Amino acid sequence: DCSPGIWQLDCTHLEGKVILVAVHVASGYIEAEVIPAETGQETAYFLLKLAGRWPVKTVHTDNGSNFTSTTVKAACWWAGIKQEFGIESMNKELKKIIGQVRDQAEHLKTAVQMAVFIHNKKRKGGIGGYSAGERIVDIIATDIQ
Ligand SMILES: CO[C@H](C(=O)O)c1c(C)nc2ccc(Br)cc2c1-c1ccc(Cl)cc1
Ligand SMILES: [As]
Ligand SMILES: [As]
Incomplete structure (x- = not known):
């Protein structure tokens, strides 16, 4: 639906640790990473990874600070x-x-990536049928032509 270069980035906490979560809004595609806590340095670093892989143009967050x-x-x-x-x-x-x-993995780290993998791969509720992972690549290839 949305611009191809729009992404959302937020932190959640689980087990005393911080999970940084990026969502490509138009697709539902997620990338995530577990860090020991929120620091500008971790956030910058994560942005640098994201941007070297996708065309990121704008990043929205629910916490501006x-x-x-x-x-x-x-x-x-x-x-x-x-x-x-704003938003x-x-x-x-x-x-x-x-x-x-969680039980299938010792470290939250691993369980998160397992969860990211299941989410990006799950078949679109019904018709169409594309997964979040398939749609991201469709949107970005389509917007290249
Ligand atoms: C992400 O960690 C950085 C690093 O390893 O050098 C860092 C760090 C750790 N501190 C900074 C403080 C001020 C400014 Br301007 C830039 C940085 C930078 C920095 C260096 C290069 C870039 Cl592209 C962005 C930030
Ligand atoms: As954050
Ligand atoms: As920014």
Whole structure:
């Protein structure tokens, strides 16, 4: 539905740890990472990874103060990203999926990536049938032509 370069990034906490979660809005495609806590440095770093892989043009968050450090503003500068001073939830969705897999993995780390994998792969409710992972790549290839 939305612009191909729009992404959302937020932190959740689970087991005393921080999971950083990026959602490509138009597809539902998630990428995630477990960090020991929220620091500008971790946020910048994660943006740098995301941007070297997708065309990121704008990043929205539900917590703006997340993006106030020089550190974060530099990553966004260097990579050509912008936010927006204003404005789901999958975050319900991802945790849920985490909850089903937790026993299968020793470290939250692993269980999260398992949950990310299940989410990106799941077949669209019915018709169409594309998974979040298939749609991201469709949107981005389609928007290249
Ligand atoms: C992400 O960690 C950085 C690093 O390893 O050098 C870092 C770090 C850790 N601190 C910074 C403080 C001010 C400014 Br401007 C940039 C940074 C930077 C920084 C260096 C390069 C880029 Cl593209 C973005 C940020
Ligand atoms: As965050
Ligand atoms: As930014």
